[PDB]
Amino acid sequence: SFEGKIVLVTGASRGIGRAIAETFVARGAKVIGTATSESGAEAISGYLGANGKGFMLNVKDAQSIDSVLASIRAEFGEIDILVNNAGITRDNLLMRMKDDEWEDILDTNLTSVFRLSKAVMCAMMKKRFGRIITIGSVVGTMGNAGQANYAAAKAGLIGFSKSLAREVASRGITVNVVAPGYIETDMTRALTDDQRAGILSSVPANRPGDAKEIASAVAFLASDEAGYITGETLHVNGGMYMI
Amino acid sequence: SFEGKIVLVTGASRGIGRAIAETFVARGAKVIGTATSESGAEAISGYLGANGKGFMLNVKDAQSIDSVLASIRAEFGEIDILVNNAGITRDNLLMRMKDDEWEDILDTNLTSVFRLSKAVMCAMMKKRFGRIITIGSVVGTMGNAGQANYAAAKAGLIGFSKSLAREVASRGITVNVVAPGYIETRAGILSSVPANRPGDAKEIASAVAFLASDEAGYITGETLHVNGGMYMI
Numbered sequence: 323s324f325e326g327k328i329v330l331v332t333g334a335s336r337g338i339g340r341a342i343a344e345t346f347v348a349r350g351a352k353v354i355g356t357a358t359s360e361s362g363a364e365a366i367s368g369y370l371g372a373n374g375k376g377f378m379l380n381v382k383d384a385q386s387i388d389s390v391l392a393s394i395r396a397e398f399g400e401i402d403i404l405v406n407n408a409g410i411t412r413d414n415l416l417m418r419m420k421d422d423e424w425e426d427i428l429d430t431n432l433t434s435v436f437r438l439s440k441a442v443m444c445a446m447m448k449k450r451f452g453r454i455i456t457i458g459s460v461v462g463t464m465g466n467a468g469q470a471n472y473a474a475a476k477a478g479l480i481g482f483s484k485s486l487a488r489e490v491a492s493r494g495i496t497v498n499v500v501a502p503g504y505i506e507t508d509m510t511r512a513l514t515d516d517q518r519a520g521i522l523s524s525v526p527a528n529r530p531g532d533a534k535e536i537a538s539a540v541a542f543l544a545s546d547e548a549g550y551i552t553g554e555t556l557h558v559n560g561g562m563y564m565i
Numbered sequence: 566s567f568e569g570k571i572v573l574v575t576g577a578s579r580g581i582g583r584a585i586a587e588t589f590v591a592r593g594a595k596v597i598g599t600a601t602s603e604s605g606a607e608a609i610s611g612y613l614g615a616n617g618k619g620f621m622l623n624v625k626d627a628q629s630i631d632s633v634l635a636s637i638r639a640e641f642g643e644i645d646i647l648v649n650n651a652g653i654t655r656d657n658l659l660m661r662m663k664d665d666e667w668e669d670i671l672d673t674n675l676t677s678v679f680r681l682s683k684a685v686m687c688a689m690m691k692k693r694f695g696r697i698i699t700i701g702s703v704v705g706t707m708g709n710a711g712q713a714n715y716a717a718a719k720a721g722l723i724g725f726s727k728s729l730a731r732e733v734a735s736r737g738i739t740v741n742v743v744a745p746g747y748i749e750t751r752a753g754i755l756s757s758v759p760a761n762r763p764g765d766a767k768e769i770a771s772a773v774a775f776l777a778s779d780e781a782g783y784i785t786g787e788t789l790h791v792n793g794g795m796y797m798i
């Protein structure tokens with residue numbers, strides 16, 4: 323149960339993000355989800371109801387971050403659990419990878435983790451409790467052709483998390499990463515059956531993952547039953563990669 | 566043997582970068598080292614001698630990168646072996662680390678690997694041979710307090726190399742990372758090294774040299790840990 327916990331979930335409009343926010347709502351938390359557009363911000367508030375609210379936040383603008391967090395501080399309070407789920411893919415083979423594509427991935431998926439962790443953990447330290455969970459990817463451990471930018475960012479937040487964990491572990495704050503595998507989004511249900519079966523051939527579980535299965539893992543690491551788990555990567559990929 | 570191969574080592578003024586550049590010269594290659602100062606550049610041209618040359622290179626400047634590459638391709642030729650070694654530290658506990666310190670580590674230690682690997686790989690693919698080695702750090706794997714920016718960049722270049730290795734493995738190019746531990750450039754950190762001694766700069770060079778050789782054509786997407794037991798994977 324998360325009765326009393328203030329939970330921030332970046333990128334919460336759909337898929338993993340929404341399933342994460344929906345899980346915390348059902349377990350008694352005050353859940354704050356973000357989208358990149360005001361329409362998404364208001365769409366989050368609709369399905370969050372009275373238990374939470376949606377905000378428009380861009381993880382690449384420090385001004386947008388100071389505003390939303392202050393807005394969160396006024397109408398809700400200090401964040402107890404931060405779930406970094408802002409993240410995009412800008413696929414290309416390296417010889418075709420443009421600069422802005424590399425820079426966009428590092429600012430959206432890696433620098434975002436540094437900036438939001440810096441802003442929430444001052445309160446987690448004085449309250450001697452905190453949870454910082456970032457959604458990485460199996461690509462960060464396994465690598466993948468055409469996603470050198472993506473894998474660099476997803477692996478970078480692991481080293482970041484391990485370093486931050488060592489800094490704050492003695493103050494009741496744990497910093498962890500959930501690494502999803504093949505999860506069924508709407509873009510999953512939109513590729514050809516030839517494509518679908520191709521990825522499944524490398525999944526021993528012989529099925530795509532479900533967004534709530536990532537939410538279950540995020541929920542566990544955030545629960546108070548995981549105070550001794552810090553600097554860890556929890557892989558949820560159905561056996562696609564085994565570490 | 567490295568006869569007929571052209572090597573480029575970024576950041577080869579001193580320490581690990583120098584030992585790497587000197588090792589490739591000692592095994593028959595034509596070597597180019599880079600520094601940020603025209604000072605350190607002429608220092609590299611000095612110790613390389615008639616078998617190599619130094620260049621001033623700022624990996625955060627795209628004009629500097631392309632200019633040095635043009636010179637190398639005109640004076641020496643296409644680069645066969647890229648050793649990514651440019652790197653800096655600006656440590657701070659996270660709530661004390663200003664955004665500039667996070668920016669500089671990523672731009673210098675991570676984005677530099679993407680820029681120069683991309684710039685050299687087109688010729689490597691046409692030759693159907695290539696070696697890309699990036700000097701990482703034990704910190705990128707074990708993590709370290711006050712070094713979240715350094716660790717994130719060092720961990721990120723491993724995710725980069727794994728993906729790139731999958732892209733070019735079939736065309737005779739391998740992409741690997743050498744991860745040093747405690748290398749002498751207190752005893753409190755030597756208390757964490759079971760070897761009970763610091764590593765030598767040339768001990769990293771021997772690693773890099775092994776990966777860059779034709780004997781290591783089947784090693785790709787791998788991190789070789791040279792740390793004396795500080796971390797074990």
Ligand SMILES: NC(=O)C1=CN([C@@H]2O[C@H](COP(=O)(O)OP(=O)(O)OC[C@H]3O[C@@H](n4cnc5c(N)ncnc54)[C@H](OP(=O)(O)O)[C@@H]3O)[C@@H](O)[C@H]2O)C=CC1
Pocket residue numbers: 575576577578579580581582599600601602605622623624625650651652653654673700701702703744745746747748749750
């Ligand atoms: N020392 C250790 O224990 C460890 C070292 N490493 C890494 O391995 C390498 C060891 O070399 P080390 O002697 O430690 O570090 P150096 O003291 O040799 O300086 C690192 C190199 O980076 C170059 N450099 C700095 N900024 C830039 C830039 N903006 N553009 C291009 N080049 C730049 C420097 O050139 P100049 O001489 O012009 O500054 C120098 O040659 C480093 O990359 C280090 O991070 C890995 C693990 C631990």
